[model samples]
Target: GPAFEFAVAMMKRNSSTVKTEYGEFTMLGIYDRWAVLPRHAKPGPTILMNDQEVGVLDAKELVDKDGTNLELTLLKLNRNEKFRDIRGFLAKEEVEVNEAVLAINTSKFPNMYIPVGQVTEYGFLNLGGTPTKRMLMYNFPTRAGQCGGVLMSTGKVLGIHVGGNGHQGFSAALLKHYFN
Candidate 1:
């Protein structure tokens, strides 16, 4: 592998809906310090793994805020909840801005090898096919069961994805500023 070439994650998978042993939802996880969902949130943060079920989420929005897009209040995993992969990701500290990241989602394939992307920049992305405040930029696909997907770099999560600005959901580091 190269410094830039990390493993290609099969990026597939929800818009704001947190899947659990219960079901898929929007107002869960971080309302208790949960997180915010963008206006045109296409794919809610949906994640996948082989187990009972942790939840589907835009891994980027771990620091999700409930109010405006610019305001980064932030959120994290449900305290009572247990995780194998994501648990290790929830570091007490935040990641650096513009650090390279990959948004992971599942795909319709046998091997399940999805594509991975990097965090290109952090700024407001015209997500609505319009304009708005500011957010980070990454290359991602807005697909079913793919919302709330995670953006990772150096084996840690960057943030959860709201939707697509052409493709990049909300930037992790940018949101990290508010650290939401």
Candidate 2:
């Protein structure tokens, strides 16, 4: 699919000319030169182009969640930079039962791949003794940086991977409720 077109590797720069990377996040989509990201990031982080070039952009956290835990961040990029435009966003109702989904990430060192999985359910995950925000539960063997990756099916973004052992994600509908 077009996963490769927008798969970005995020990192916190330790120093100038240093290749050290702290934690990582994934680029969900780009809206008006602003790249939306998961909240698992640092201020003024570096966004890597799918090729090898990188851009040092400012980070802004979307704090007004209306009381719910909607984890998202935004990075402003230059207009000259080419980003894969997110054209389609599929809501939970539009998604089918057991439909295939791919979680794309570029955090595994230098290589990258999109794993195929199917949706299992959608609801609030029980956090400790209370219910947390709404999420999409699926089945996929994922890694650390896989969190906040783009969850796509049929070339359309469905959710943002939130790292429930690779099973939980923020549904696209939830995303629409916030920034759409």
The numbered model that scores best in lDDT is 2
- Determine the C-alpha RMSD for candidate 2 after optimal superposition of all C-alphas: 6.5
Question: Distance from true position, residue 150, model 2, in Å?
Answer: 1.5
RMSD of each: 8.1, 6.5
Candidate 2 local Cα displacement, residue 98, angstroms: 1.9
lDDT on C-alpha atoms for all candidate structures: 0.38, 0.48
lDDT of 1 by residue, 1-180 (tens): 221233233122111333333222232122232343333332233322232233333334222344334422233433453222233333454444444543332332222222445454455545445443445455555444444445556545455544554454554332323333
Candidate 1 C-alpha RMSD relative to the actual structure: 8.1
Candidate 2 residue runs with Cα over 4 Å from true position: 1-22, 45-60, 63-65, 82-84, 90-97, 107-116, 126-132, 166-174, 177-179
lDDT of 1 at 77: 37
Question: On residues 67-145, what C-alpha lDDT tens digit does candidate 2 reach at each position?
Answer: 5444555666644744444433535343533454444445353335455556654655654343445556666555565
Number of clashes in model 2?
A: 0
Q: Which residues of candidate 1, in runs, are more than 4 Å off?
A: 1-67, 70-115, 129-134, 140-144, 165-180
Collision count for each candidate, in order: 47, 0
Q: Model 1, residue 40: what's the lDDT?
A: 33
